[PDB]
Amino acid sequence: GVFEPTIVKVKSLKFATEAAITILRIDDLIKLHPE
Amino acid sequence: GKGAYQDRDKPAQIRFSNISAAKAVADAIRTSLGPKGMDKM
Amino acid sequence: EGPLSVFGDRSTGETIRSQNVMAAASIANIVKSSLGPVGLDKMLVDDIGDVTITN
Numbered sequence: 001g002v003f004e005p006t007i008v009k010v011k012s013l014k015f016a017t018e019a020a021i022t023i024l025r026i027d028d029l030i031k032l033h034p035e
Numbered sequence: 036g037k038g039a040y041q042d043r044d045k046p047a048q049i050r051f052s053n054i055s056a057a058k059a060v061a062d063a064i065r066t067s068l069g070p071k072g073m074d075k076m
Numbered sequence: 077e078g079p080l081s082v083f084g085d086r087s088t089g090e091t092i093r094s095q096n097v098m099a100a101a102s103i104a105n106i107v108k109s110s111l112g113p114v115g116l117d118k119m120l121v122d123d124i125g126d127v128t129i130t131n
């Protein structure tokens with residue numbers, strides 16, 4: 001009797017992949033000093 | 036002929052300081068160019 | 077550094093790729109003990125003393 005809605009696992013796949021892409025494409029950080 | 040002595044070194048050292056400043060900016064954004072260039076944050 | 081006076085700092089290459097991941101893996105390590113039917117809760121205390129218990 002262990003069940004879960006299918007929209008939970010479908011959405012979590014799409015959100016976890018798009019967030020990994022945007023972090024992966026970064027090859028430089030410039031941090032500006034506060035004023 | 037050996038005339039036209041150049042007794043001031045300020046224009047020479049300034050023209051060379053503009054080259055190194057501009058060449059350094061072009062080297063910074065060389066990586067992000069083309070279909071396989073990455074992103075800066 | 078030398079050239080490129082930006083009045084900041086910069087990191088390029090494998091220094092920033094292996095630092096963006098130790099920062100992501102630490103956040104996931106906080107909530108890794110609160111998963112499934114055998115997971116426990118947590119306690120959060122602020123500077124004034126407001127206690128919040130959640131998982």
Ligand SMILES: Nc1ncnc2c1ncn2[C@@H]1O[C@H](COP(=O)(O)OP(=O)(O)O)[C@@H](O)[C@H]1O
Binds near residue numbers: 067068069070072
């Ligand atoms: N699929 C591709 N294969 C090879 N070269 C490409 C491709 N797409 C774009 N380019 C080339 O990359 C060059 C630079 O593009 P890009 O760095 O993305 O933006 P920008 O044109 O603003 O520099 C362009 O002159 C273009 O001819």
Ligand SMILES: Nc1ncnc2c1ncn2[C@@H]1O[C@H](COP(=O)(O)OP(=O)(O)O)[C@@H](O)[C@H]1O
Binds near residue numbers: 111115
């Ligand atoms: N009775 C159970 N037996 C086995 N696995 C379970 C049971 N209840 C929940 N789970 C699993 O625990 C996982 C995590 O759920 P939970 O720890 O409650 O937090 P969240 O629901 O936010 O992920 C789910 O993927 C689910 O499959």
